Amino acid sequence: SAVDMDECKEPDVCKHGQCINTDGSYRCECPFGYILAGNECVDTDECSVGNPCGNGTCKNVIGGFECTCEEGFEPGPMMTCE
Ligand SMILES: [Ca+2]
Ligand SMILES: [Ca+2]
């Protein structure tokens, strides 16, 4: 039928990312929290910036990051210390 080659659904193009099938091309636009390594889309290292916990330590996670404030507190999923 001529299925416009997805290009992004290929195992060597996007891979875990939001793409947009164009005429004869594509665009691997990763979500908010991910990135692109030449094609493979995945999560980045948010802990690479600064301990988001505010004082504890940063950790890398998906859709955000993980952090362990000064033992004795209660962190969260991928937001910050609280
Ligand atoms: Ca296409
Ligand atoms: Ca991350």
UniProtKB/Swiss-Prot annotation:
The disulfide bonds in this chain are C8-C19, C14-C28, C30-C41, C47-C58, C53-C67, C69-C81
What happens when you mutate V13D?
Found in a patient with Marfan-like syndrome; likely pathogenic
Glycosylation (residues): S25, N55
Q: What processing steps or modifications follow its translation?
A: Cleavage of N- and C-terminus by furin is required for incorporation into the extracellular matrix and assembly into microfibrils. The C-terminus, which corresponds to the Asprosin chain, was initially thought to constitute a propeptide. Fibrillin-1 and Asprosin chains are still linked together during the secretion from cells, but are subsequently separated by furin, an essential step for incorporation of Fibrillin-1 into the nascent microfibrils.
Domain EGF-like, by residue range, is 4-42, 43-82
Report the subcellular localization.
Answer: Secreted
What is the disease in the record? Marfan syndrome: A hereditary disorder of connective tissue that affects the skeletal, ocular, and cardiovascular systems. A wide variety of skeletal abnormalities occurs with Marfan syndrome, including scoliosis, chest wall deformity, tall stature, abnormal joint mobility. Ectopia lentis occurs in most of the patients and is almost always bilateral. The leading cause of premature death is progressive dilation of the aortic root and ascending aorta, causing aortic incompetence and dissection.
The family assignment reads: Belongs to the fibrillin family.
What is the designated name of this protein?
Fibrillin-1
Q: What lineage does the source organism belong to?
A: Eukaryota, Metazoa, Chordata, Craniata, Vertebrata
Residue window of the full protein shown: 2124 to 2205 of 2871
